[PDB]
Amino acid sequence: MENGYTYEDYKNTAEWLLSHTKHRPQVAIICGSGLGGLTDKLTQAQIFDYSEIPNFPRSTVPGHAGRLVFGFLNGRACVMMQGRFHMYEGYPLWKVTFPVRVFHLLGVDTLVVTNAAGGLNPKFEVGDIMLIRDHINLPGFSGQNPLRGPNDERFGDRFPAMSDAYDRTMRQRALSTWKQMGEQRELQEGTYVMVAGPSFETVAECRVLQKLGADAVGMSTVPEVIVARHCGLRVFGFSLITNKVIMDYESLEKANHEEVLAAGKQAAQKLEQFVSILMASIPLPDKAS
Amino acid sequence: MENGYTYEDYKNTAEWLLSHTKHRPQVAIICGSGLGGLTDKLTQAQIFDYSEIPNFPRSTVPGHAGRLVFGFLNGRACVMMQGRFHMYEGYPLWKVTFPVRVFHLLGVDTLVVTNAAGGLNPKFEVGDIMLIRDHINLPGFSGQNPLRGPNDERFGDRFPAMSDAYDRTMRQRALSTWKQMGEQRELQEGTYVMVAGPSFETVAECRVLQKLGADAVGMSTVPEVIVARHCGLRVFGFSLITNKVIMDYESLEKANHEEVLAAGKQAAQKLEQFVSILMASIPLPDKAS
Amino acid sequence: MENGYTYEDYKNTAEWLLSHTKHRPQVAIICGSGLGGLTDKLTQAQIFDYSEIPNFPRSTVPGHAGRLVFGFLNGRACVMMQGRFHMYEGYPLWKVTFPVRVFHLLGVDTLVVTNAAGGLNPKFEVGDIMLIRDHINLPGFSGQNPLRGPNDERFGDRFPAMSDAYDRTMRQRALSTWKQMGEQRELQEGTYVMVAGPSFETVAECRVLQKLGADAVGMSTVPEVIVARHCGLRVFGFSLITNKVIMDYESLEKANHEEVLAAGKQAAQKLEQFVSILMASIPLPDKAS
Ligand SMILES: Nc1nc2[nH]cnc2c(=O)[nH]1
Ligand SMILES: Nc1nc2[nH]cnc2c(=O)[nH]1
Ligand SMILES: Nc1nc2[nH]cnc2c(=O)[nH]1
């Protein structure tokens, strides 16, 4: 089905934003379920609710705190999308991913995407942090892909390969940094799988996902990632683990979202220090820097 | 995408039904492809075609026999949805699942769902009966979920866990009963996987489903189940097996739907006795019973 | 969701075509990404752009060369759909598959479908040719199936089995022929899996597909095949392999579509000789031939 948004539509929204803030972003950060904390630390903050920005999808119902704060963070200047969009919310996939495209028109040349995810690996302990190395997009195998439709050769190719989705150096540079702060627990790596559904995962299901080779399940990021790469954005991101089951031979836990708690603890504080430091290793342009 | 139905819409339909029958249901039974027999045995029968009930989706084309019979069965009073709704019929998932939600507004506190399913396990012999213990919902991994949209906090949470979908005691109580009737073949248990498609399963496909860990394939129940649990309905159900292939090294059968026959035999008679007796172990409320 | 097309709609389009060309097709060939060459070799050629044919979906944007050429090839008379329709193009599945249904109304009793596919098996070497023996349709597990809706009992059953999708003799007859031309490399066989998405496959993903048991991945054919069989069309086809990755432990290739090249070489010339000869083993009717 078409992409309602019309190139002119992303143009008008890039220019407008670009004409209301004297900040020319370089990095776009997308924070998820208990990582809006990463906001505060911006320095020359400048906030625009998703409501003024002309074509931006207004955020539905939650804690509502969903705005787009512009600022400078640890040397590089960036954009912070605080409270993103998911499928389970009823959004066509070209709506959730509108953010990522205006960004590309903004100047941005890096896209770091966080998200509070599952944890389907026995080695991970709630609270950890997983360096997304790859993804398994199940909603994409079926036709639900943000690129499904005619293509705007102004943005990217028709058949972009995702083989190298998440940058390599940025991931070594992150891998290093972790060492470099003298940190207790190690920042892991694995592959992430997007499940779309609002409800949580059956023990029966949690075993296919493990079987398929995923490491942490979730309901976001794969779209924004896919359309970033389409643009030649340099992507890469972390996943903050918070749980998961595997036993029906009999258990007696479940896994709520009340547990925005897990992230709503020091998983937050940590993931902030960790991305503030990382700003310092993102190749800046200028005239070769 | 929105859920057309508006809470007021399920309200009007609960009240109307609740004002046309002097029966206050406690259990809702949903019968599938050759289990409408379970109807007859109701005692103080009262039938409403899906056509009078104001917002109820009218049943498309088949043997047409799709009505909602109210009655009393073996001690408990119940609702019998005779001939349900599936995806392959062209129904948004919020249409098939309208039944389950009016029920919850009716008073009902248990939801037993039958369905004539595949059989992907070598140990099962056509005619058996599988006690659904869990599910693998593939149409849910992609975005096709009945909860996909804004959420009516009047019904349930936003992120319900399905970890414990199908009740435990009810399943021990069923497991026992089978013994308790002195029965020839044993009532099995395994996990059920919903495939949406009207056409049947390739031998190539039948091996992923086995690989993924399913025990019996089918085209229904997972939606009604998921939205039951959302409500705090107590769910649980059986699957009446009737076939399946696994060999392309060369075979020469196929599997029709003509075979509404399998169920359209003593798989029916059996699954009736078996759910009539089971009515006797469903905790009733009153004022603690 | 309904099938917009109304039987009368496929009727009008069959009759019109049937009244503009003095050719009564027997075989329908569908060629994909670099196999339109197979066109030239028709002998009593007769071309109709997808644009005149009244209800035919007009082909979107590409090299545009998307017309339907009627002719006689190697003894049998056929229809050649040059440049098909895919999901990633934004087409409801009942649009891509309109071709296959008018054909069935044309008289056609065989449907050979080519398609330039992946290659997920280590034994295959780019350039090969895979005799599609079976399929794994992932977009069908989720609800995206061309038969999803009311059913026109004029065409086929409601629950067609696909157990025997791709004909057996035709596949032995093809298997033989390969020998019979004294050919260097052997024409393989394996099972094909349809991924819908325009973007290409993650290394993470490429391993589920291998795991699931596929041999060559792609973004087409499964729909046209499924609806052919529904009609009792005799289907069968080849896949021309052209690539694939499996290593993220670190590699450094990707896989473009620029590589319409692979097919846009002697994979084309070969796949032409090979289907021209095969015309000679397709049982013709007449009055028993
Ligand atoms: N899909 C999914 N998303 C989550 N977000 C937080 N926990 C989970 C989980 O267990 N599954
Ligand atoms: N999906 C599916 N549903 C069925 N209903 C009855 N038999 C089957 C089967 O083999 N597959
Ligand atoms: N899905 C898919 N289609 C293709 N078409 C050509 N190569 C490929 C591939 O690698 N994947």
| SS (HEC) of chain C | CCCCCCHHHHHHHHHHHHCCCCCCCCEEEEECCCCHHHHCCCCCCEEEECCCCCCCCCCCCCCCCCEEEEEEECCEEEEEEECCCCHHHCCCHHHHCHHHHHHHHHCCCEEEECCEECCCCCCCCCCCCEEEEEEEEHHHCCCCCCCCCCCCCCCCCCCCCCCCCECCHHHHHHHHHHHHCCCCCCCEEEEEEECCCCCCCCHHHHHHHHHHCCCEEECCCHHHHHHHHCCCCCEEEEEEECCCCCCCCCCCCCCCCCCHHHHHHHHHHHHHHHHHHHHHHCCCCCCCC
> Residues near C287 by Cβ (< 8 Å), separated by ≥ 6?
none
Interface list for B 120-139 with A (CB within 8 A): 133-137
**Per the structure block, which two tokens stand in for A136?**
């398994």
In total, chain C counts a number of residues equal to 289
C216-218 and A130-137 beta bridge pairing: unpaired
Instruction: Return the DSSP state at A266.
Output: I
Tokens 């079987």 correspond to: A211
Contact assessment for residue B23 and residue B103, using Cβ atoms and an 8 Å cutoff: no
Phi-psi region of B124 (alpha: psi -120 to 50; beta: other; left: phi over 0): beta
Q: Give the Cα separation of C139 and C194 in Å (integer).
A: 7
Torsion, CA B249, CA B254, CA B255, CA B256, rounded to 10: 170
Instruction: Return the DSSP state at A146.
Output: T
Q: Give the Cα separation of B139 and A197 in Å (integer).
A: 9
Q: Give the Cα separation of A209 and C208 in Å (integer).
A: 10
Instruction: Return the DSSP state at B133.
Output: E
* Phi, psi dihedrals of residue C116, rounded to the nearest 5°: -80, 105
**Per the structure block, which two tokens stand in for A141?**
């195998």
* Cβ-based neighbour number of residue A282 at 10 Å: 21
Burial class from Cβ neighbours inside 10 Å (0-12, 13-18, 19+) for residue A219 reads buried
> Residues near B22 by Cβ (< 8 Å), separated by ≥ 6?
none
Question: Element (H or E) spanning B73, and its range?
Answer: strand B67-73
Q: Give the Cα separation of A46 and A263 in Å (integer).
A: 25
Q: Give the Cα separation of A241 and A119 in Å (integer).
A: 5
Strand partners, B218: B194
- Residue C138 Cα to ligand 1 midpoint, Å, equals 23
**Per the structure block, which two tokens stand in for A211?**
């079987």
Interface list for A 168-227 with C (CB within 8 A): 191, 211-214, 226
Going from the C-alpha of A194 to that of each of A120, A126, A219, A237, B129, the distances in angstroms are 13, 19, 5, 14, 34
Q: Give the Cα separation of B145 and C14 in Å (integer).
A: 38
Strand partners, B239: B130
Q: Give the Cα separation of C171 and C189 in Å (integer).
A: 9
CB-CB neighbors (< 8 A) of B133 in chain A? 248
> Residues near C36 by Cβ (< 8 Å), separated by ≥ 6?
C65, C82, C83
Instruction: Please indicate if any CB of chain B lies within 8 Å of the CB of A144.
Output: yes
* Cβ-based neighbour number of residue B123 at 10 Å: 9
Instruction: Return the DSSP state at A166.
Output: B
> Residues near B1 by Cβ (< 8 Å), separated by ≥ 6?
A90, B92, B148, B149
Instruction: Please name which of A161, B202, B200, B246 lies closest in space to residue C132, comparing C-alpha atoms.
Output: B202
First to last CA, chain C: 42
Q: Give the Cα separation of C203 and B266 in Å (integer).
A: 50
Instruction: Please indicate if any CB of chain B lies within 8 Å of the CB of A85.
Output: no
Pick from B1, B147, B212: CB nearest A199: B147
In total, chain B counts a number of residues equal to 289
Question: Element (H or E) spanning B71, and its range?
Answer: strand B67-73
Distance of CA B120 to the CA centre of its chain: 19
Strand partners, A67: A49, A82
First to last CA, chain B: 42
Going from the C-alpha of B26 to that of each of B23, B223, B284, C285, the distances in angstroms are 9, 21, 8, 62
* Phi, psi dihedrals of residue B22, rounded to the nearest 5°: -90, 25
Strand partners, B166: B235
Q: Give the Cα separation of B217 and B12 in Å (integer).
A: 36
Q: Give the Cα separation of B62 and B32 in Å (integer).
A: 13
C33 is catalytic: yes
Quote the radius of gyration of chain B (alpha carbons, Å).
18
Is B88 labeled as ligand-binding?
yes
Mutation test of ligand 3: which of C124, C200, C254 has the most ligand atoms closer than 8 Å to its C-beta? C200
* Cβ-based neighbour number of residue C256 at 10 Å: 14
**Per the structure block, which two tokens stand in for A169?**
């150096």
Phi-psi region of B211 (alpha: psi -120 to 50; beta: other; left: phi over 0): alpha
Burial class from Cβ neighbours inside 10 Å (0-12, 13-18, 19+) for residue A286 reads exposed
Is A220 labeled as ligand-binding?
yes
Q: Give the Cα separation of A175 and A163 in Å (integer).
A: 20
Burial class from Cβ neighbours inside 10 Å (0-12, 13-18, 19+) for residue C12 reads middle
* Helical segments of chain A, H only: 7-18, 93-96, 98-106, 169-180, 203-212, 222-229, 260-262, 268-277
Determined by: X-ray
CA angle B62/B65/B67 to nearest 5° reads 125
* Phi, psi dihedrals of residue C91, rounded to the nearest 5°: -90, 130
Instruction: Please indicate if any CB of chain B lies within 8 Å of the CB of C254.
Output: no
Instruction: Return the DSSP state at B58.
Output: P
Going from the C-alpha of C52 to that of each of C16, C17, C55, C66, C102, the distances in angstroms are 10, 10, 9, 12, 14
Q: Give the Cα separation of A212 and A214 in Å (integer).
A: 6
> Residues near B15 by Cβ (< 8 Å), separated by ≥ 6?
none
Instruction: Please name which of C5, C25, C51 lies closest in space to residue C284, comparing C-alpha atoms.
Output: C25
Quote the radius of gyration of chain C (alpha carbons, Å).
18
The residue numbers preceding gaps of C to N over 2.5 A in chain A are none
In total, chain A counts a number of residues equal to 289
**Per the structure block, which two tokens stand in for C28?**
């329908």
Contact assessment for residue B217 and residue B196, using Cβ atoms and an 8 Å cutoff: no
Quote the radius of gyration of chain A (alpha carbons, Å).
18
Instruction: Please name which of C108, C105, C128, C106 lies closest in space to residue C117, comparing C-alpha atoms.
Output: C128
CB crowding A83-116: b at 16 or more within 10 Å, else e: bbbbbbbbbbbbbbbbbbbbbbbbebbbbbbbbb
Tokens 């709704």 correspond to: B85
A27-31 and A76-82 beta bridge pairing: parallel
Specify the fold of C1-289: Rossmann fold (3.40.50)
Q: Give the Cα separation of A220 and C192 in Å (integer).
A: 29
Minimum-distance ligand to the CA of A262?
1
Q: Give the Cα separation of B81 and B95 in Å (integer).
A: 14
First to last CA, chain A: 42
Resolution in Å equals: 2.8
Q: Give the Cα separation of C82 and C76 in Å (integer).
A: 18
Instruction: Please name which of A266, A287, A279 lies closest in space to residue A236, comparing C-alpha atoms.
Output: A279
Look at B211 and A211 and tell me if their CB atoms are within 8 Å: yes
Side-chain half-sphere exposure of A263, counting CA atoms within 13 A: 26
